Amino acid sequence: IRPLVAGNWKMNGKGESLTELRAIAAGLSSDLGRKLDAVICVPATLLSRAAETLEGETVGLGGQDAHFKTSGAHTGDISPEMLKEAGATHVILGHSERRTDHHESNKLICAKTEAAWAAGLVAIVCVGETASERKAERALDVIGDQLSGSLPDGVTAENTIIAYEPVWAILTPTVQDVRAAHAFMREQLIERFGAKGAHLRLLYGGSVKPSNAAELLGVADVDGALVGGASLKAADFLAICETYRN
């Protein structure tokens, strides 16, 4: 499985930040970048400008959310077609921050996931359990439910990526923690999707930094990362990518 390092800028980044994007492009201009895929998910306000900056580079662009409809009376909401037409190849769906603060349900994320595929986008679908779900020993129940409710029947290794977010630690998770969450995801996805389940990229979406990337990304059934803060600066992001030097 080819690795993917995806950056989630969350609600950071304006015109000035585009330099970081260029530097990431530059850093992956060589042998390193030929070895992995990389996608940076920027705010919707920055996407077209970022698409221009990245024209002819290996680095892909994501949005951080999209609606389930193509268009309509939905003030303030962005369609996946809009993301597509502005230059996105990917969109993050079901991020913990939206499941929690925006109350997004598994059903909604499923509908967003189909609509994303219909617009030509790869869905980066996030799952993850809270501290109390974990303290209550329901971690796997919850991850399992999120995966079976958030993912539509038509998943392929090409149209869907899964990111695991240990929301519970928002504590640092152990290698052991990461290992057991990702083995569980892999077995869940194979049970439901068979062959292609084995090919779906599972990204680790906990706290990923240059200093912990080697240990976390060397874990079985981790196929990359959904990097938060460390993706805002090209030097951090590139040092995380350095992991796949070999």
Add this chain to the structure above:
Amino acid sequence: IRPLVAGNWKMNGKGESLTELRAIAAGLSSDLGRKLDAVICVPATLLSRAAETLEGETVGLGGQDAHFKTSGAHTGDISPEMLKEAGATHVILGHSERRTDHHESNKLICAKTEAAWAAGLVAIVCVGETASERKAERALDVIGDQLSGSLPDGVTAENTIIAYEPVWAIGTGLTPTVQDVRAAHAFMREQLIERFGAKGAHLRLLYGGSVKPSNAAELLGVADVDGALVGGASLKAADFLAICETYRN
């Protein structure tokens, strides 16, 4: 009070839509645009390109929502500074679609309005009662609670515009009467004067119900209506402009 026709594209608009902004700008190059302000509120994905499209022109640009913080861990949210830096001068906040479908409270909208101001944006803050609240005989009580709860203490006549949405009418095929509009706007004016004094007398109060080339003259002649927040009819330049032509004098 100088009138403002604002257009709300809602979740409509891509690169191909930019010619419409262009046509609107050109229609308002006449003697017309000297008399009124115009703002089109476009999807955040289009904002920077729409900014580029309208460079130099009188037509302002709006966002359709914005966060209450400047930045941070809010995956998929847009801060009012991102709108500002992309070229917007305005942002719609508290639209009924967001109050209903995104469960936005007065408290959230208040927090969003402060942040909009701190980013250098004029907040277009929407209020409006449902058919249920109307049948409860609480129309005015609802609009009053929304205005008091949604608006921060720092309102100025320059940093805030209010738009009234007759949400009750949506989906019914009936359009509010001049009597309905007058009563809502007279009420909003009195409330804003009680709370903000003379600032409250100069606040622009936009009519955000169904406004189309066919009804614009009557509705926009209503006392205490200082313009409109136009929906569907802002999607096509000729419709938007025919609403604006109501103000030719």
